[PDB]
Amino acid sequence: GSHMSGIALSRLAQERKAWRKDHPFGFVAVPTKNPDGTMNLMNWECAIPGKKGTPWEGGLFKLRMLFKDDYPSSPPKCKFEPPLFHPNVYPSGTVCLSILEEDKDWRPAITIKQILLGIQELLNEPNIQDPAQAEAYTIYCQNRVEYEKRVRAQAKKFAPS
């Protein structure tokens, strides 16, 4: 056991408690289980639903949330699994966002709900000023009609079966 996780484990426990009682519709945020069956609050498997009225609509995108020992001083590491086609998502699947940066807009008070809702808004409102992947960026900038097909295609490929 990480005896260095006292503060984080405490904060993550109340975080989970607050999510169960109330969270956005369509979203999913649950801790993973350890080798045996213990609850692992340092590693979450989440799901972000595409926003309605957008080409992402109807898709249910999975990503894992990883917390470090110093959390909530530092933000969790977010990575879409499998990697997502989007200009602010690195090929590795890591999501590029301001509130997920210690040196920037991240505050210890930011909730998982805020992070997940923040990432959901990023989906249809990308930041072309700061692209994480070349492909999605180039297509978005050179052929938005084609960009929409890819996104719609991706949303269909990840629709709740």
Partner: protein, 74 residues
């Protein structure tokens, strides 16, 4: 017993109460009844996973004030 909140796309808030061991199959059919639509016209989810009839609130580890999302079965 346990308190469960059943919500949907239309934000329709409907609360319920069921024992910790009671067959969830009941409430599944119950909501469809309370509402006014065919049984297999609605799908019930919890923590992402779809809720099966033979499931038990004790098995799903549910708790008070918990929430259960409902999507029109397709």
């Amino acid at each position: 017993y346990i308190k469960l909140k059943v919500i949907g796309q239309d934000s329709s808030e409907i609360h319920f109460k069921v024992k910790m061991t009671t067959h969830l199959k009941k409430l599944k059919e119950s909501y469809c009844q309370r509402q006014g639509v065919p049984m297999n016209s609605l799908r019930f989810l919890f923590e992402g996973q779809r809720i099966a009839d033979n499931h038990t609130p004790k098995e799903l580890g549910m708790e008070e004030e918990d929430v259960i999302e409902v999507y029109q079965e397709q």
